[PDB]
E3 ubiquitin-protein ligase PRT6 (Arabidopsis thaliana), 150 residues
Amino acid sequence: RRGSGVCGSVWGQNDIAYRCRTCENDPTCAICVPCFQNGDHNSHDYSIIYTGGGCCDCGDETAWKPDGFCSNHK
Amino acid sequence: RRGSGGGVCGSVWGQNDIAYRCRTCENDPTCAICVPCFQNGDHNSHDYSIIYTGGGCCDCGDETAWKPDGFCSNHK
Ligand SMILES: [Zn+2]
Ligand SMILES: [Zn+2]
Ligand SMILES: [Zn+2]
Ligand SMILES: [Zn+2]
Ligand SMILES: [Zn+2]
Ligand SMILES: [Zn+2]
């Protein structure tokens, strides 16, 4: 989308990333592995995802709760 | 957000870099795709414009922002 503090980092079709059902705005949202690990999802309902690729929504509050942002993306 | 078959593009523009808006394909007026994705897709008869503003990241491959009919050939 257009506009300018978001990861937006990108993974391929057979690259892993993370889904977190506690932090996501909806089921199409996801974050990269570095941003998941530098955040805290203890007790959240998260899974590793294997398919589809994506751009990291870490730092983007239309797609991800701010409580769920990693330490590098406020 | 996540891909749906052919992955996503996610390439990023700067403030004064151009890209394409397509009103036929967009989900809302903030969506946009990068020039390479526009060229490798089919928007004949669509109401598209070259846009010059504010930076962003390409939405090709993200079904929440762009009709899959309008995905480029490299994003399925
Ligand atoms: Zn990330
Ligand atoms: Zn992050
Ligand atoms: Zn979470
Ligand atoms: Zn179009
Ligand atoms: Zn693109
Ligand atoms: Zn594309």
Remarks:
- Chain B has one domain: 9-76.
- The interface with chain A takes residues 1-10, 12, 15, 19, 30-32, 51, 53-57, 59, 61-65 of chain B (CB under 8 Å).
- The radius of gyration of chain B is 11 Å.
